[PDB]
């Protein structure tokens, strides 16, 4: 049983501190802190119905996909504020959606234990359900695409999985979480993916392999969302305690805590700028907040949303951000100058 | 301003018209959240109203009563460790707690579940409809009298049936007393917090009941009536 587990886990805890050194905040304080970053709503896509659960930027940094509880999956043109596609989703509690890197497929998860993948660039011109992935006993909570051949999906049965859409069966099942997994992030090289669960623990797996490679502890509540650093060796987790944190992938411990006395309500989604200097956080304070990377200080607020900002995404161009909230409005924020 | 972009804008406006129709059909519907145990036969009650629009997890029961349409969303396939779908269900018009009355063993678990419902963080405002089903099973099993109601619940002896009750003519008085004791337990765990925020409506039903849709529509109508009284400053 647990005769040796407690002794064999001692080297896990001391390793994160014995080989560590001073935190990155004091070291990076020598760099110039970014000034008050104010960012304006350049466009508002007031098309959706209900609370917008999740959104995903297209690979072109111009196409958006967003999901609502009614079963609406909408692909917007962000540059002109036009909706390219509207898809009526059958599983009408889609927590998350995603855009395939090739841009031909859009996948939506949800509470209904399945992954619905839809064809965009079909020879017919009408978006039809390409496939449905079944085999998860919990609720799908993140649906990030790996590539056109395979898709990673984490659900509410404390497990994530890697599927191949063409055949359908669960190619690989990653288990090891205690509570339901609420969000995963896929690295830019699409070779490792990190998923965080309600057990206040995150875990990195291997898409080709099947067992966990990294575990991460230090949150005091559910890990509400996780987003990879664009570098690929770090990721940010936003939790219910409003104490969003950054974990270095290799270093295998918490680096610093993004905390303040003003913030009370928890996080709902996290995203990163291309350089990562702008970690935005979709707090439940009814307004997303954009803070720095090296100094861990609040830099601005993307206020303008009546309700909680439920999702947050930075383009692959690193040029704009999109915030989706419970007011059914998607706001595209960009720098004023 | 390009011709292709002009046609793209025309397409976006067509989707805008579709989304306005979508606006109307979403605001013309009221979400309802089933919740209960597996012994409760929630899916049995869902079949009882009408043939459900299947699709596990969602069961997606859209129905109209008296020319008023709304969409109840039966659930139960997800994990029951914490019911984390409740956060997704916080705007729902009402939550239907469905429970059975024959099996006294799980009634303590039913009371615990109702206590968890009535004080949830996302349930501080949502009203609750109580559906006590399989009442005929309880009546028959207590007419047999093999299992005393006193051993599981020692407060039956001190309880005498209230006069406000309107039992059916063929109902045995002890059957009525058991029915209203099992009702009073849930009523008493309900009427302890959030009196004005929500109110738990009780009901008795069985496997076959043609008035399930009418009754649930009336209950949601009362919930909306109170919501409008609060919202439109008439309170």
């Amino acid at each position, epitope marked *: 049983l647990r005769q040796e587990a407690e002794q064999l886990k001692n080297q896990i805890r001391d390793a994160r501190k014995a080989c560590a050194d001073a935190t990155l905040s004091q070291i990076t304080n020598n760099i110039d802190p970014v000034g008050r970053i104010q960012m304006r709503t350049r466009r508002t896509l007031r098309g959706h119905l209900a609370k917008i659960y999740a959104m995903h930027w297209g690979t072109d940094s111009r*196409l958006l996909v967003s999901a609502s509880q009614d079963g609406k999956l909408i692909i917007w043109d962000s540059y002109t504020t036009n909706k390219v596609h509207a898809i009526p989703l059958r599983s009408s509690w889609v927590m998350t959606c995603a855009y395939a890197p090739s841009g031909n497929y859009v996948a939506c998860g949800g509470l209904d234990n399945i992954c619905s993948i839809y064809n965009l660039k079909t020879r017919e011109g009408n978006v039809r359900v390409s496939r449905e992935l079944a085999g998860h006993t919990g609720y799908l909570s993140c649906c990030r695409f790996l590539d056109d051949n395979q898709i990673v999906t984490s659900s509410g049965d404390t497990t994530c999985a890697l599927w191949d859409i063409e055949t359908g069966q669960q190619t690989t099942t990653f288990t090891g979480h205690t509570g339901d997994v609420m969000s995963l992030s896929l690295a830019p090289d699409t070779r490792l993916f990190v998923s965080g669960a309600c057990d206040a623990s995150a875990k990195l797996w291997d898409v080709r392999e099947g067992m966990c490679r990294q575990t991460f502890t230090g949150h005091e509540s559910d890990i509400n969302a996780i987003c990879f650093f664009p570098n690929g060796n770090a990721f940010a987790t936003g939790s219910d305690d409003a104490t969003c944190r950054l974990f270095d992938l290799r270093a295998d411990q918490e680096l610093m805590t993004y905390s303040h006395d003003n913030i009370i309500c928890g996080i709902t989604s996290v995203s990163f700028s291309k350089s990562g200097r702008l970690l935005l956080a979709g707090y439940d304070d009814f307004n997303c907040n954009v803070w720095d990377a090296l100094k861990a200080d609040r830099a601005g607020v993307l206020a303008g949303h009546d309700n909680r900002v439920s999702c947050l995404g930075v383009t692959d161009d690193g040029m704009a951000v999109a915030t989706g909230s419970w007011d059914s409005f998607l706001k595209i924020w960009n720098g004023s100058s | 301003v390009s011709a292709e972009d002009k046609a793209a804008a025309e397409r976006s406006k067509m989707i805008e018209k579709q989304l306005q129709k979508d606006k109307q059909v979403y605001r013309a519907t009221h979400r309802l959240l089933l919740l209960g145990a597996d012994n409760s036969g929630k899916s049995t009650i869902v079949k009882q109203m009408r043939i459900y629009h299947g699709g596990s997890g969602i069961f997606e029961t859209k129905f109209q009563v008296d020319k008023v349409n709304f969409h109840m969303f039966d659930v139960g396939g997800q994990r029951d460790e914490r019911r984390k779908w409740i956060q997704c269900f916080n705007d729902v018009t009402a939550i239907i707690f469905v429970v059975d009355s024959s099996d006294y063993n799980r009634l303590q678990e039913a009371l615990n579940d109702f206590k968890s419902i009535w004080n949830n963080r996302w349930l501080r405002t949502i009203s609750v409809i109580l559906f006590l089903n399989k009442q005929d099973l309880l009546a028959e099993k207590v007419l047999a009298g093999k299992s005393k109601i006193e051993d599981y619940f020692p407060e039956f002896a001190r309880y005498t049936t209230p006069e406000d009750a309107t039992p059916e003519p063929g109902e045995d008085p002890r059957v009525t007393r058991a029915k209203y004791f099992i009702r009073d337990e849930f009523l008493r765990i309900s009427t302890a917090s959030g009196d004005g925020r929500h109110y738990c409506y009780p009901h008795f039903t069985c496997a076959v009941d043609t008035e399930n849709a009418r009754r649930i529509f009336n209950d949601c109508r009362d919930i909306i009536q109170r919501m409008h009284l609060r919202q439109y400053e008439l309170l």
Partner: single-chain antibody
Amino acid sequence: VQLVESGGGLVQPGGSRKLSCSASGFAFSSFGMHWVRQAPEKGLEWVAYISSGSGTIYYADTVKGRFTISRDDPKNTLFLQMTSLRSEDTAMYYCVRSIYYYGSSPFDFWGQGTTLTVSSDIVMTQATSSVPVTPGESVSISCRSSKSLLHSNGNTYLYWFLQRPGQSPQLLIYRMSNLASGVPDRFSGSGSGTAFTLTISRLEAEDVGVYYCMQHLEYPLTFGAGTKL
């Protein structure tokens, strides 16, 4: 996908009649139906266009007026009513599908055309008209335009098509440097400003026919008689 069109043949000048194009299992209710002509042993030319959910019915100034087009989403049929025909209108006809998103493929499928016999704008030149059918080369077709088609968006609006002897012309290069689906990697397109060049990797027996091109900023949709293979 099928866009097979039907109609009659010979008709008098006072032969006001209807010519239809019927589609197979289709997304017709959300497609911007175009309508193209082709003079005998000559190039193509517009006749009309009706967007999905008709709001922008456009015509060509050559035949604007008497000619009319309409869409029928329920029964999925495109009508063309023609009144007071003249001796010029006798030509091949094609019912073409086209819709526009941020990155859509326009003018993909051309239905089997129908014959008709009867008893400013940007100009497409296509000066070259004869090209050898010799295989194993890298021949290219050059295209002129009245003005640069590179709009401020960042995309050109010129379309390319090949026509083998008997069939409707399948698209090759929508916009520039943007291949379609059925067309293989062999075809390609490039250029800059008013200069356009459709290049071919290898030559085989299926590259024969005439090439055609259309501008799209404004809506004359005129063509230029390309190289006969």
